[PDB]
Amino acid sequence: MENFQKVEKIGEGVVYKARNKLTGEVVALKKIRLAIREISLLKELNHPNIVKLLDVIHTENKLYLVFEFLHQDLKKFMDASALTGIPLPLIKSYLFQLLQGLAFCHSHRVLHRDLKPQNLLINTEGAIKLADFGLAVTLWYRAPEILLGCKYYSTAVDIWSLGCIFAEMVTRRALFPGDSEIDQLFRIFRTLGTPDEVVWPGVTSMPDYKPSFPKWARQDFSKVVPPLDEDGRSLLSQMLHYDPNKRISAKAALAHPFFQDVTKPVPHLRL
Ligand SMILES: NCCNc1cc(-c2ccc[nH]2)c2c3c(ccc(F)c13)NC2=O
Secondary structure, three states, rough: OEEEEEEEEEEEEEEEEEEEEEOOOOEEEEEEOOOOOOHHHHHHOOOOOOOOOEEEEEOOOOOEEEEEEEOOOOOHHHHHOOOOOOOHHHHHHHHHHHHHHHHHHOOOOOOOOOOOOHEEEOOOOOOOEEEOOOOOOOOOOOHHHHOOOOOOOOHHHHHHHHHHHHHHHHHHOOOOOOOOOHHHHHHHHHHOOOOOOOOOOHHHHHOOOOOOOOOOOOOOHHHHHOOOHHHHHHHHHHOOOOOOOOOOOOHHHOOOOOHOOOOOOOOOOOO
């Protein structure tokens, strides 16, 4: 670890941009403080659309995770495109790539659990990668089953989160900017309608389900993410299904007609 030289803090454990004094390579260091080699498997989980975990340095009373370093996260890129708006071809490519990474680790029975713009990294080659996988403060992207107390949720929670992000890239506003758990759950219910046994069997048996939840109708998906086309709205619709079992999987999402004309644009980045 005396092998590394900090360059700057880039994320808040904390994450630093570091320079390996020997290899001379620049990386991202995750400093963790406050017993599972779930991490040891993550180490072998390599894919072009997943930020690579280079090393795990366990010494003293700290745990440092050395990762591949990308220059910009999707959040910063979105604000930089706020007035112009991320072009659809670029949006499509990004969606497509993330779905590739998710399909990959999901087939390995590994979930990210906390997908969000800041956990998505981009480079100048037009690539976007999943970063900072969580292990078993913003609730904006949490799927409803989690919000409802599901202890053993599936890979479908990453799809929900990605769907929210998809919606954000298109509209340039958070789909569900909740500021507390109930508020998050209620902003979700206000948009897609309160879930019931019809559209989500077993929902009322969810640990935090409350028969007293207000009952809202589902608003038209045409009001949710304009001016996205029919294909896009069809895909988002299936990524946002209440029932985790009916929610589309990453793999099947790859075959959605929306990705028929998918290309790989190269973003104009201002590093
Ligand atoms: N999700 C909070 C911050 N986490 C990481 C951020 C970055 C990053 C931000 C701006 C540029 N880069 C990186 C990053 C990483 C590996 C693991 C991480 F958790 C983060 N490699 C990175 O480049």
